[PDB]
Design a protein around this nucleic acid. Sequence first.
RNA 1: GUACCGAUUGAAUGGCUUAGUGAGGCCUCAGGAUCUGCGCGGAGAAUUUGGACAAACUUGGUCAUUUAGAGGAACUAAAAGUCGUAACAAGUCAUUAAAGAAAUUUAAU
RNA 2: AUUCUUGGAUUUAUUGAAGACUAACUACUGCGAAAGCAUUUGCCAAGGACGUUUUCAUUAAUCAAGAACGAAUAGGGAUCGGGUGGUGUUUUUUUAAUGACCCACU
Lengths: 112, 562, 214
Amino acid sequence: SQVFGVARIYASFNDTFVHVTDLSGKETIARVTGGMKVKADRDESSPYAAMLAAQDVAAKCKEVGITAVHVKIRATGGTRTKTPGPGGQAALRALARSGLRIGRIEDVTPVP
Amino acid sequence: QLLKIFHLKTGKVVRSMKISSPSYILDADSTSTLLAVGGTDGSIIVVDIENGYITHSFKGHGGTISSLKFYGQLNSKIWLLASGDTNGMVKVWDLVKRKCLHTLQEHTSAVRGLDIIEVPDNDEPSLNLLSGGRDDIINLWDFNMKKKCKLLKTLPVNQQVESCGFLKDGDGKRIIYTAGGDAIFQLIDSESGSVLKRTNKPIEELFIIGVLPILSNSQMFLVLSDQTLQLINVEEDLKNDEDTIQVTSSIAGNHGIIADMRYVGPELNKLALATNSPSLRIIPVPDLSGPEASLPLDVEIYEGHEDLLNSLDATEDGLWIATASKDNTAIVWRYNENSCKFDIYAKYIGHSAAVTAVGLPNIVSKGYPEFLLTASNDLTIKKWIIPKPTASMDVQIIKVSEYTRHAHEKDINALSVSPNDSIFATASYDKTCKIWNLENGELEATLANHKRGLWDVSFCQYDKLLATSSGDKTVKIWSLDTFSVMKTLEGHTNAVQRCSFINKQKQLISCGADGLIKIWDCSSGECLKTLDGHNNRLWALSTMNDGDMIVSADADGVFQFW
Amino acid sequence: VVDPFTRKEWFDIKAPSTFENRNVGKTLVNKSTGLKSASDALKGRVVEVCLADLQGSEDHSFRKIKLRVDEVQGKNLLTNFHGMDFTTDKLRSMVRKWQTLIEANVTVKTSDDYVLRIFAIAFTRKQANQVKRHSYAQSSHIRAIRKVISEILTKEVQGSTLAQLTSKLIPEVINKEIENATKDIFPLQNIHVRKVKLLKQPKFDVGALMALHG
RNA sequence: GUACCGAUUGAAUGGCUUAGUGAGGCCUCAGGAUCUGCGCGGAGAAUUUGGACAAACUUGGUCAUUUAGAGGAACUAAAAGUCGUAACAAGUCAUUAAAGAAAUUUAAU
RNA sequence: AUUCUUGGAUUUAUUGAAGACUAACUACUGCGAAAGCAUUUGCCAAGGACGUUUUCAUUAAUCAAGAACGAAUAGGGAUCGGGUGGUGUUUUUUUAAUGACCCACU
């Protein structure tokens, strides 16, 4: 039906990283992050900044051809907080509104 | 999802088309000049007129579209004539309803320009159908209103295609422009499958091209590229008068970012700017219109480099234009586009780091403007001085081994010549500015009281002062004796990149990361005026002799005269 | 300004035999020039997809399958089985208080000389009409449990190359063989395989590769 | 900054020139890394005595001008810098047909 | 604020290297005289309870000096290990059986 990819949302603290890849995971596209979309060095995980960057990330992916995508949520992991970040829920809600598809998602927290 | 309809040059919306769910990507206009249908990624076609009437749903295939063209009896996209697809397929339809007449499947590569230009007869007694936009080959298709089709020839003579052209009369005996994504456009021959001549100006992928309203072998032709346009002669091959592919003109525009600027014309005519592009664009000053049409020389951009340009400079009359880039070389260009090699006087090799600043000595008529004083990030500075022929004509090596002046540990960011040839001071990123003599290359003076590196230094033309800029929000002015610090200006709300005097030795004009230009005076040391019509970082500056027009540099391509 | 997405080849993935539908998905490679041709450049890309998303059987939503590229032919490329892994949600669902976690590992060669190390997970259940709240092991039965798994896993490997072993991993026939033999010691619960990974592929060897293709 | 007096004739160039220095090819007595051919020649590198022709290079002095110019006397610039002193000024609605699945187009009243 | 960054930082996929530790299970449970003790497997001895119709025959106990190692009254319920019994079950479409379980006794 569609052409697929993985979105791999890395919701850390004081930043949010979103970058969609190919099916293999070596080929990248639209790497744009949440900290880019405001300049105060404090709201870098604020959800309106997360909703801002997720729109522009879904913008270029809609302009290349990718329409369906898996997400892989990911915290900082290891000896860190192991907790999904602030700009993870609204950002997943932001790109799902953009006109893409969401299905069969899971967790890639390094939990050792 | 914006496909909006306008009228006469007011530009008001007549009707808004956002109905279809996929994003509209392509659109073309009509020979009826009233109807418009857009190409999209859902293969969705909607024929609409402007009063408005947005007719019958045509829905018979998916895929995506990246090329479209019309016809007077088949007035739709390449979904009706053929099929704009992501796998490549020709589909036969009609102006009558959604029945499918014939089908044609030959491609294995994606191609969207299957009928990117018409065959105007659709009977082809000696005519052809040309096609290619993604499959990187050129195919020659027949047309049959009732039977299957035939391939006339295939052309693997290309390596990449984006758009195909076709002669207006349709015989193909004359010139046929084919624009490919391989930074190459060609003149081909349809009945023989051979090229006339191939032309290689650009270093970037060609964009898609439409049509000219001209007939056969034309009078002019326009080539599309990145923020530049060029007009080409119409033979390119022994056709009417000339051959061995050439370029008629290359009209320059403006780039978003600018590093430096310097007046070229001896009566302050020409400005040359150095950008992220590896070219020399000379529009700005005499052109109070848009793109260039009124510079009194052959308008043509220069290229002799492989990377971006760092700093550029010229002398008074403007015959020698020395430029600096990241290709470790120094190249000087001529005013009126003449030389012995191409347009280059000489290219100077010997830099072991990037060439980040360039400078000329003072004018006399010759000699000093024939010379070159360039700078590199190898913590040295290099003077190329060969007086016995006319210098800047030949490759010169005079300072490569140990004649170079090396006392730096952080890089020099600028360099300035005094009105006399004796002393010159260069500023450096290690919070100092050094005076060296030009006759010997010996350390004359060391001037330093700063808190950040020094990006620009320049002299007064009465050689009584010194003007330098540092990132501690201050502009500092020194004496001519270097026994006493003269003046220290503060008031700039951020760092200052570049400072300069006026030619009447009246005012100090500064440029920095504030967002507005400031003109302090060098006489009372106060604020004569500030000027605020910017919101980006200011990086370059240039001063005319008369003092009314002052040109500035921004981060978006805006040149404000005052 | 380059816009590489008008230059990248659009390309697809073909799957091996002992599966459901051999259509998988898409990638993006490069433009095939000379000096960086696209075929010889990568040759080793890794596809990691849940097998339930390809088999269709929805009672397999864990146990993702790792793939590895071998050959390329012109809007087709063929891949090979590299690894098998559980999701983190599946095993951390299992680990309950007041029971015993028994693991096993074994290094064992296949028929064709793929050397692969699998793991093992074993958990203790309560019987019917238990009174006590834990039902642990004895710390010598765990020796009697690890040993029975260790001799069974060396029997099933080195036979009828890895696709048939892949054809046993999918309906998890291995777990019943663990189940019946080791029940006489102590009964058990959930036991699965939890991993298989390879490190000693012998050679290129196109000859046996095309025997699975239609 | 400009015009002038004046020591250094310093550096550049021009006139004259003491002094030292000297490329290059020509011939001939000797020589052989090397060549297709019914006893060996066309061709050919180094080295070599003598003889004719020979451009020209380096530096010192005399004189002029520029530059550098100690020192000596002006003009202009800087309204400039400090201090003292003086007076003025200044707050197309509805019902309803036709095409169109939907909008929309057109007619009717 | 410090730092890194177009010779590409951060993120992504593939490897190799170095050091470190056994994550949910992990308990008011076990072991050790104490200080202490958590990956598998092999080897080397040491130890306790239980069972014993084997054996020595007062061989006992407690503690200045001193040494090794370490900064330097009588019930109840649950649980660990061993043993005994079973009008007992379960694994047994395999004949047996090891083993887990149910209950009593110590």
